[PDB]
């Protein structure tokens, strides 16, 4: 099957372009055409839905007229024209707001019409290259096909950010290249495909199949209807008397098509349920540690791990696990495989629910007897030497704290009595300063090292362990200015602070990233880069107005001990990607290998419409969201399980094509 060489490098290079032009599409709509947000999201979703529903207009026009490999060429040409009318509609010089809109919309329309009709037909054509005697090697071809698709997706994710940023196309931000590169690579794929015209095994279409199928099914739904008569409406099956016409060599084919269609009924719900992890799992990742000690991993980037697992399990599965199954009588009939894929998907969402139930158990470390939690913050310009001691210079704590930084650690200062007037030993700039802050046991305390001109002093702050509500954090502030401030993170209440090292009161603000907060003093208004604020974490911010560096806020955090890392989410990624690989590849092969020779691509159309109806269900359901995450995952697991049982029962009775 050497001629499949120019079938996989084409799918790679066109999925690459499609995923590249999808990611930048929303940014282009919002920031170039300057469209309203609801209009932009609406048109983007409409374009995706059109991409998903058009495969019928490709499969029918392949298996009825014009054949295929003459639909691939003559439809990828329209696809190229669509990319041209897109990249031409991003030119910022000629025309404005009417040309730029007309070309863009025509480009979306033609690109959708191309992709939805290249996607099924290319896989069907790749299948046809093989011989029925070599029925086994087709499975590896479809595995390689899916590998190429997800490799394209992966490379698009890694390389599209390097296109839409800081280029000049003509006097403004550069979106033509962000569209030109996908178009250029796709038209360079249309030339690698056409090179194989001397190599393929082009099957001529056998007849006006979709016309024949529709006419046959209509006549079928006419014979049983014997209103005031009848003795043999349609006996032993529901087509067997749609056979007085339409010779039987076709009636078997339409029977097979109907049986596979009846089998594919439950699947769209599964596609919707599996889809609802691209965003909700990211919300899960937002609420957990991610530094990893090697590379601080942003929660958004976690997504790219999904295609990577496909690239690492496809050659793992198809070359290890499937053979290891074949060691004995275990008979995967390419339907048990899809059922077990469904089962692993359900197990994956159950594991996600378990992870949720574990995350909501964060508590910051409570104190037992003779235990106070301390956390020293330094603001002296140089470096300071921190020591805490007892009655007689008796060891309680030694620690060298550096200059301006943040801090998240602490230390379990083993106190000694009901209350110990702590002797602090701070040494800085070769100075000896010792003050006493009487403290109560089993609490949390913080120090501020501040520049008292030549010398320094220690300020003690006692935290009251007011925990914040679920999925939300609490903050308090320390002021170092000469005037009282007002830092209103929240909507209604203007939080206030005090001058000359004052203390604020705890405020409970929504978790997230706060880049700038209103801060009005007696005279001046400004803002500060508070940055990220994880939930279940008590933050303390010190506001400084140092002469050299201006207004900057020095972080100081509490911490939940049992904060699970960004790991422990790979297991649910592993179990969902195993489901995806065991399901998609097997579905492609099953659709191709259980289809009559005259309609080899309408089954691919049925599979793609399954995915499309799944997307439509995703769209309709996603708006009706009012449930907690853990309950959401347990419901998505129970529903997926019942769908799996429905599919298993409806597959145990599916007679195979022969």
């Amino acid at each position: 099957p050497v001629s499949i060489a120019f079938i996989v490098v084409n799918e790679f290079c066109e999925r690459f372009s499609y995923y590249g032009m999808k990611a930048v599409l929303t940014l282009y709509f919002l920031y170039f055409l300057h469209w309203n947000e609801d209009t932009s999201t609406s048109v983007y979703h409409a374009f995706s839905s059109l991409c998903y529903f058009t495969p019928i207009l490709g499969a029918a026009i392949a298996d009825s007229w014009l054949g295929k490999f003459k639909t691939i060429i003559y439809l990828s040409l329209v696809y190229v024209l669509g990319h041209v009318f897109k990249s031409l509609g991003a030119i910022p010089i000629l025309g404005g707001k009417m040309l730029h809109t007309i070309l863009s919309l025509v480009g979306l329309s033609l690109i959708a019409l191309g992709t939805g009709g290249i996607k099924p037909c290319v896989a069907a054509f790749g299948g046809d290259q093989f011989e029925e005697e070599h029925a086994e090697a087709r499975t590896r071809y479809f595995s390689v096909f899916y590998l190429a698709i997800n490799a394209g997706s992966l490379i698009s994710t890694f390389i599209t950010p390097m296109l839409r940023g800081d280029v000049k196309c003509f006097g403004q931000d550069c979106y033509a290249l962000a569209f030109g590169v996908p178009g250029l690579l796709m038209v360079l794929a249309l030339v690698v495909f056409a090179m194989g015209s001397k190599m393929y095994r082009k099957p001529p279409p056998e007849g006006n199949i979709v016309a024949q199928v529709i006419k046959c099914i209509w006549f079928a739904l006419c014979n049983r209807f014997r209103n005031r008569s009848g003795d043999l409406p349609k006996r032993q099956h529901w087509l067997d008397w749609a056979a007085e016409k339409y010779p039987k060599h076709l009636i078997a084919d339409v029977k097979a098509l109907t049986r596979v269609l009846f089998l594919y009924i439950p699947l769209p719900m599964f596609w919707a349920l599996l889809d609802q992890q691209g965003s909700r799992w990211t919300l899960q990742a937002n609420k957990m540690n991610g530094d990893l000690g090697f590379f601080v991993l942003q929660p958004d980037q976690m997504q790219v791990l999904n295609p990577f697992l496909v690239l690492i399990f496809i050659p793992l599965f198809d070359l290890v696990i499937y053979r290891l199954i074949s060691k004995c009588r275990i008979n995967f009939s390419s339907l048990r495989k899809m059922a077990v894929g469904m089962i692993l998907a359900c197990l994956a969402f159950a594991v996600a629910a378990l992870v949720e139930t574990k995350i909501n158990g964060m508590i910051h470390p409570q104190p037992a007897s003779q235990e106070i939690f301390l956390q020293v913050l330094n603001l002296a310009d140089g470096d300071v030497k921190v020591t805490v001691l007892g009655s007689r210079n008796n060891s309680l704590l030694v620690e060298s704290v550096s200059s301006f930084q943040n801090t998240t650690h602490y230390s379990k200062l083993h106190l000694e009595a009901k209350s110990q007037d702590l002797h602090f030993h701070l040494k800085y700039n070769s100075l000896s300063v010792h003050n006493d802050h009487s403290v109560e046991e089993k609490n949390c305390y913080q120090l501020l090292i501040h520049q008292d001109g030549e010398s320094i002093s220690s300020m003690l702050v006692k935290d009251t362990g007011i925990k914040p509500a679920n999925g939300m954090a609490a903050i308090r502030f320390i002021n170092t200015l000469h005037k009282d401030l007002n830092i209103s993170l929240d909507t209604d209440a203007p939080l206030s602070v005090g001058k000359d090292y004052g203390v604020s009161a705890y405020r409970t603000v929504l978790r997230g990233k706060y880049p700038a907060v209103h801060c009005e003093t007696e005279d001046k208004v400004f803002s500060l880069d508070l940055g990220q604020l994880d939930f279940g974490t008590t933050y303390l911010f010190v506001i400084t107005n140092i002469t050299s560096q201006g207004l900057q806020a020095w972080k100081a955090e509490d911490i939940p001990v049992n904060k699970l890392s960004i790991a422990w989410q790979l297991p649910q990624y592993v179990l969902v990607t195993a489901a995806e690989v065991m399901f998609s590849v097997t579905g492609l092969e099953f659709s191709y290998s259980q289809a009559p020779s005259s309609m080899k691509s309408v089954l691919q159309a049925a599979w793609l419409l399954t995915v499309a109806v799944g997307n439509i269900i995703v769209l309709v359901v996603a708006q009706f969201s009012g449930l907690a995450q853990w309950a959401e995952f347990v419901l998505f697991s129970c529903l997926l399980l019942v769908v799996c049982l429905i599919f298993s029962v409806m597959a145990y009775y599916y007679v195979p094509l022969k």
Partner: nanobody
Amino acid sequence: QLVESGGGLVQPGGSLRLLCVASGRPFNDYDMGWFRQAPGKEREFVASISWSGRVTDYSDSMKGRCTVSRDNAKGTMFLQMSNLVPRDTAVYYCAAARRRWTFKATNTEEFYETWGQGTQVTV
């Protein structure tokens, strides 16, 4: 609808926060934008925040730094300039537009329908 406005004089290098409340209808259903008008013959788009505040866009100038935000509760929108200079002494207008399906640009004096009075921020 019936929008309002609050803000004032500045030092040559200070900053401000502009406030705009909705006085007669649910502020959630309103796309929102900021305009200026120098004491000349212009009407410059300044910044724009979309419904739910999820998408924000700033003009090419966006003097120093600007940040728009909105809380659909209490129905108010916040503009925060950073580096006001002796330019942009203008009459900053606050503009609103209902959530329709239109292809009109979000950064023009055409999409917004009901801009109210404006402050007289000087520098």
